[PDB]
């Protein structure tokens, strides 16, 4: 990370968090940070625990993608820019061959392989569009963003369907409203990669050849 | 609907206030439009 301290602190923090998906909270008063995770032991919940109001919304059209490019600054290019890009055959087949390109730039990452492995995460995540909202009684107090929920509801066929908590609102009475964002497990697993050492372009300039 | 158009146009300032409240909460404001 390099920070220009003339940027307002809120914006610097926001970009810093965005660089690694973190988010911060002050519910329960202490400042807390909660990265996204695949959790082995989510909190189980069932529809009948709720107040019974439930809404599901899905926004595939804008949010979904099937190919990506990312841009970085790379010392192997003399801190010029590099532009990683790749497609996904299976996703393009599941979509009706419609090509759609995700654009990215990473300000603070320079290890090419790390950048690629992270972009793969973002692409996989973008398939999981669903968001869900409902309300909980007070006994479930202590929830935060990026807690892992397993949701179970027979009528929809959902069975330990996995979600991360994405928004929370406490109240004086104790009633809790929540919203969940779907994720899969596979979001957090990278493929193999291949050695990229063959293109360490030395961008020499401003020099005069000797006799 | 038309009654709501007439009402809202008659009460426009309060809507602008509410929008500014939301955007300020996230950290933004319409005044950028004023300068822009």
């Amino acid at each position: 990370t390099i920070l220009d301290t003339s940027e307002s602190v809120f914006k610097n923090v926001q970009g810093l968090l965005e660089s690694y998906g973190g988010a911060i909270n002050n519910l329960s008063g202490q400042y807390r940070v909660t990265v996204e995770k695949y959790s082995n032991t989510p909190l189980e919940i069932n529809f009948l625990d709720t107040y019974g109001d439930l809404e599901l919304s899905d926004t595939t059209g804008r949010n979904k993608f099937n190919s990506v490019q990312a841009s970085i600054v790379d010392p192997a290019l003399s801190w010029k820019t590099n532009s990683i890009t790749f497609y996904n055959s299976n996703y393009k087949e599941q979509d009706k061959n419609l090509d759609k390109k995700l654009q990215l730039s990473f300000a603070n990452i320079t290890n090419y392989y790390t950048a690629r492995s992270f972009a793969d995460r973002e692409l996989k995540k973008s398939r999981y569009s669903r968001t869900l909202s409902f309300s909980l009684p007070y006994q479930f107090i202590g929830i935060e963003p990026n807690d892992a929920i397993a949701f179970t509801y027979d009528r929809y066929g959902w069975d330990r369907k996995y979600f991360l908590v994405d928004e929370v609102e406490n109240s004086r009475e104790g009633k809790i409203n929540v919203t969940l964002q779907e994720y899969g497990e596979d979001v957090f697993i990278n493929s193999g990669q291949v050695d990229n050492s063959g293109n360490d372009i030395p961008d020499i300039s401003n020099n005069v050849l000797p006799p | 609907a038309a009654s709501f158009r007439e009402f809202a146009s008659s009460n426009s300032g309060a809507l602008r206030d509410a929008v500014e409240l939301a955007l300020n909460e996230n950290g933004a404001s319409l005044k950028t439009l004023g300068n822009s």
Binding site: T60, K64, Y87, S89, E93, Q94, R127, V194, N199 | -
Partner: protein
């Protein structure tokens, strides 16, 4: 307006109670293979048969209004189906589903007293269409009261083909993008991502990224990474402040930290554009001999007209330029063109595919090969006959074989020019390169049913139609959705003759785009 059959107009004018059925043809979501089911539904109180297709009744609850206006918009709809139909919930909530495209069509039928559908559209002699488009999203709402009745409902949201105004669908000079590379089992491969299957062959752009870093060693510090911008005057509208507009109009860009510069532009009519370099090298024995490849424009262009090295054009602008400087022929009255440099005589013709032009500036040879970017172009034979001999310097320093360049470097669908500079005491550096070209060929239609598809057209309709129906780039709209007999009337409007002026007042005419100064060149609108 679409003209309805007048029997329907009369029936509607007479009868006071009318029955209407909405008929929905819907592609199933989540076909994991390309083959998909369809389902057919109606809001009508009982099932109905049409084209022998039986449309089920009862699932539908409501359909939104549908608004359009003179501005472009997504024209969105929604419609709702009962949340109690267990199948439809399962149709949403499967995990493996995708529906990023699925098609929908909504017919609107007048049903007469005998239960037949009234003929209305004189094309099909059948029911109208209320809407057609693609699915974009959906949702479920379940409300349970503590007491009394709750409700459950499913919404589908639909829109036209622009449902993601963020979509960028150009081409840009990077091999992995062009071929469509993906990683498998520890190596890269071409896959489905290529915008067409043939591209997977094309090792074009493979050298591009490093080539610029080579080219910089032959330019003054003024230029070493700079490039001229494209489409300097984007359209002004009341959205802009006058100041902010003219202050954002910008002549130059740096490719260092800028990727957008490397997107290929599209051209219709006559325009001047800078070359994108994609390869640079020197002959091994004689580093004073430098080959460079500039890509220019998408598709088959009608051809190159002229080249500018720096701002100096090869052809004289007028008698005073000819006095100041060595140059051949004149643009101003005669509309001379670079064909003259090969013929030795005045010509208005564009370049020809693959000829060698020798621009003797009087400062050592410039040589040009021009390829119009038409499909099935080969790799350039002059380059091949070097790499095949291992004649390139950097080829011999890296130790690559003829793999360095051969018949696989086709650069399909992409106009490009090979420049062979000679460097000497009177031309101590390579200049900037930009060119004037006559643009992409477009499928102009005729009311008689011909499709001439031969040349550029200055008409804005045929320009739009090509840009929309292009799928390599642009909106990927299928031609069967357009009413040709309407569009031809629109072109017959837009090609009205003006007489507020006369052609003899326009000497430039060949560069303006007119192919002949005498045949009427005047129409209310001409676009470049």
């Amino acid at each position: 307006m679409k003209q309805i059959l007048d029997s329907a107009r009369n029936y509607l004018k007479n009868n006071s109670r009318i029955k209407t059925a909405s008929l929905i043809s819907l592609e199933l979501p989540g076909s994991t293979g390309t083959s998909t089911a369809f389902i057919y539904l109606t809001d009508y109180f009982r099932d109905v048969i049409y084209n022998g297709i039986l449309y089920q009744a009862g699932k539908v609850k409501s359909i939104s209004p549908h608004k359009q206006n003179r501005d472009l918009s997504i024209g969105s709809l929604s419609f709702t189906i009962t949340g109690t139909a267990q199948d439809e919930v399962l149709k949403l909530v499967q995990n493996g589903v995708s529906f990023l495209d699925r098609t929908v069509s909504i017919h609107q039928a007048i049903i007469t007293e005998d239960g037949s559908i009234l003929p209305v559209d004189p094309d099909t002699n059948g029911p109208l269409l209320y809407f057609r488009g693609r699915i974009t999203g959906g949702g479920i709402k379940d409300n349970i009261s503590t007491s009394g009745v709750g409700t459950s409902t499913i919404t589908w949201n639909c829109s036209n083909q622009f449902y993601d105004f963020d979509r960028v669908n150009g081409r840009y000079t990077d091999d992995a993008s062009h071929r469509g590379l993906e990683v498998v089992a520890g190596q890269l491969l071409p896959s489905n991502g290529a915008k067409r299957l043939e591209y997977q062959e094309d090792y074009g752009f493979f050298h591009a990224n490093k080539s610029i870093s080579i080219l910089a060693k032959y330019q003054v510090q003024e230029e070493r990474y700079k490039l001229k911008s494209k489409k300097k005057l984007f359209g002004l509208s009341r959205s802009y402040s006058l100041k902010k507009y003219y202050e954002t109009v910008t002549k130059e860009v740096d490719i260092d930290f800028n990727l957008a510069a490397k997107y290929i532009p599209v051209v219709y009519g006559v325009q001047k554009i800078p070359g994108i370099p994609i390869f640079a090298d020197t002959e091994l024995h004689n580093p004073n001999i430098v080959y460079v490849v500039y890509a220019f424009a998408e598709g088959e262009i009608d051809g190159f007209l002229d080249f500018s090295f720096g701002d100096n054009p090869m052809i004289c602008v007028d008698a005073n330029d000819s006095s100041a400087r060595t140059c051949f022929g004149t643009k101003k009255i005669v509309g001379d063109t670079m064909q003259r440099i090969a013929s030795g005589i005045s010509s208005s013709s564009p370049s020809v595919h693959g000829q060698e032009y020798r621009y003797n500036d009087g400062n050592g040879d410039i040589r040009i090969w021009t390829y119009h970017g038409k499909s099935n172009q080969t790799a350039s034979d002059v380059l091949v006959n070097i790499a095949r001999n291992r004649g390139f310097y950097l080829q011999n320093m890296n130790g690559n074989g003829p793999e360095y360049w051969d018949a696989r470097y086709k650069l399909l669908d992409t106009a490009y020019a090979v420049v062979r500079f000679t460097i000497n005491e009177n031309r101590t550096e390579i200049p900037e390169v930009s060119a004037e070209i006559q643009g992409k060929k477009v499928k102009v239609y005729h009311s008689d049913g011909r499709v001439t598809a031969n040349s550029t057209s200055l008409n804005g309709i045929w320009q739009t139609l090509d840009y929309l129906t292009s799928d390599r780039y642009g909106a990927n709209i299928t031609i069967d959705q357009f009413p040709l007999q309407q569009l031809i009337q629109e072109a017959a409007i837009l090609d009205i003759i003006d007489e507020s002026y006369q052609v003899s007042w326009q000497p430039y005419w060949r560069y303006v785009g007119w192919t002949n100064p005498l045949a009427e060149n005047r129409q209310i609108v001409q676009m470049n």
